[PDB]
């Protein structure tokens, strides 16, 4: 029954007649061998824990980034544009939490197979760049925000400038973008992982490259598999 | 406060649209009631 089904070069899954079985293999376009169980961090926990983990306040001193982890802690408090950026990030995180908790995973399960292991990448970066020691990071908040935002737009599953193509491309990476934004939050990067700049560009490049490597290859005979 | 003002403007616009559509709907309701009376 399933022998003549194959992933074509436009991403669709078709039989020998050319009839479409799926508009994207596995509904994400990934290969079955390139996925791993990962936890999406925005799903579990109470609202207080989520707020404590992800919210950053640049007006209140005791609810801000610790001063010993960043070199530029002096000229951060009182800035309003940077607070606008942080508020946009937090609103995106809250929207992701609502979308995952009310639509996709209603029962709250947060351990799902997803491509490119983020924890492994982060600890590899920490080992490579010697991210120990109480040294203060030189990674500005706008760099973090813009880097993650740009990364969430370079995960190409489908190429093309067509509007319908762009909509399908955005749909195909929703869960993975939620994972990436959950892990690479500003507070977590500056405090929990303590990445510096070079580690940050290395992490972004590695994520992009591994995602490109985890796609399905046109010519797979996925029906027989 | 600017966001609140914009929200209020959009709410007022939606209210006006709903009022206009209700005004249109009442004519159809009257016609339907008259025709149902005719059938009886």
């Amino acid at each position: 029954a399933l022998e003549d089904i194959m992933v074509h070069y436009d991403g669709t899954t078709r039989n020998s007649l050319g009839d479409i079985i799926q508009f994207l293999y596995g509904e994400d376009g990934l290969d079955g061998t390139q996925v791993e169980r990962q936890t999406i961090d925005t799903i579990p926990g109470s609202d207080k824990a989520f707020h404590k983990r992800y919210y950053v306040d640049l007006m209140d001193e005791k609810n801000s980034i610790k001063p010993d982890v960043i070199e530029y802690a002096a000229d951060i408090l009182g800035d309003v544009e940077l607070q606008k950026e942080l508020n946009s990030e937090y609103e995106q995180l809250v929207s992701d939490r609502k979308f995952l908790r009310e639509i996709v995973f209603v029962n709250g399960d947060h351990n799902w197979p997803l491509p490119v292991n983020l924890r492994r990448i982060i600890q590899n970066a920490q080992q490579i760049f010697h991210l120990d020691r109480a040294k203060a990071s030189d990674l500005t908040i706008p760099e973090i925000i813009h880097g993650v935002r740009d990364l969430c737009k370079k995960l190409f599953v489908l190429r093309g400038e067509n509007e319908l193509i762009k909509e399908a491309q955005q749909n195909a990476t929703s869960l993975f973008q939620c994972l990436v934004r959950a892990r690479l939050a500003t507070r977590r990067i500056l405090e929990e992982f303590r990445l510096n700049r070079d580690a940050f560009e290395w992490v972004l490049g590695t994520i992009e490259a591994q995602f490109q490597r985890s796609l399905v290859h046109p010519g797979e005979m996925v029906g027989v598999i | 406060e600017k966001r609140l003002e914009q929200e209020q403007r959009r709410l007022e616009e939606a209210r006006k649209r709903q009022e206009a559509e209700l005004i249109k709907r009442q004519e159809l309701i009257k016609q339907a009631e008259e025709w149902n009376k005719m059938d009886i």
Binding site: D10, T12, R14, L17, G18, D19, I20, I21, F23, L24, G26, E27, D28, L30, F99, L100, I103, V104, F105, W112, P113, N162, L164, I165, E167, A168, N171, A172, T173, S174, L175, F176, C178 | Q18, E21, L22, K24, R25, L28, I29, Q31, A32, W35, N36, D39, I40
Partner: protein
């Protein structure tokens, strides 16, 4: 008693029909949407509590948004039939009523069953469209089920854009039957495409398309 349960089922069917008309693009007033059960008993039930199906018929016109998106959307006439069994005479007079009042679409809800002869004259009511529903299957709105995702009928331009994007032929899309319950809920005509946005545990959101038959 049994009168109360009959009235309740009739009210639920009325609410489902109004929701269906709203989904297909027509305009239903918000007050009429939330028209409660006690109000229904007040307006329909007589002194003995018996209902009149003839007092439930209504009319609707497309909203400006639906009219702009779908250019083929006319006026809709929904009528409930008092006769428990409908025959050729009743269907003929319903067709006459539709033709004389130039309604684009007519929905005719019967109670028990429809004779095959009445079924025969449904396709010859052109250009108006006559769709028949039973009272029993309208008690529950299936589109509110958990397992039923949201179906949205595609306009002609969107269908053309889809076929051009995938470089397809209409026979190469996944199909949905014309008698499919959601297809009859949406009033799908042969050759029309519905876009189904669906929950996916691998990507979160997945949009699928199906073509009617």
């Amino acid at each position: 008693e049994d009168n109360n349960r009959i009235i309740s089922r009739l009210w639920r069917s009325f609410r489902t029909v109004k929701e269906m008309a709203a989904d297909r693009g027509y305009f239903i007033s918000q007050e009429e949407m939330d028209q409660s059960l006690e109000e229904f008993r007040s307006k329909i039930c007589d002194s003995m509590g018996n209902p009149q199906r003839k007092l439930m018929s209504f009319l609707a016109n497309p909203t400006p948004e639906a009219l702009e998106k779908y250019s083929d959307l006319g006026t809709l006439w929904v009528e409930f039939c008092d006769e428990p069994s409908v025959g050729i005479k009743t269907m003929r007079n319903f067709c006459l009523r539709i033709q004389e009042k130039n309604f684009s679409t007519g929905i005719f809800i019967y109670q028990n069953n429809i004779t095959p002869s009445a079924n025969k004259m449904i396709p010859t009511v052109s250009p108006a469209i006559i769709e028949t529903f039973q009272e029993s299957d309208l008690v529950v709105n299936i589109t509110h089920h958990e397992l039923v995702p949201k179906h949205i009928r595609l306009s002609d331009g969107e269908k053309s854009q889809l076929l051009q994007r995938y470089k397809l032929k209409e026979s190469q899309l996944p199909r949905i039957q014309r008698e499919d319950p959601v297809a009859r809920y949406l009033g799908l005509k042969r050759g029309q495409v519905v876009k189904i946005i669906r929950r996916s545990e691998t990507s979160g959101r997945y949009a699928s398309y199906r073509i009617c038959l």
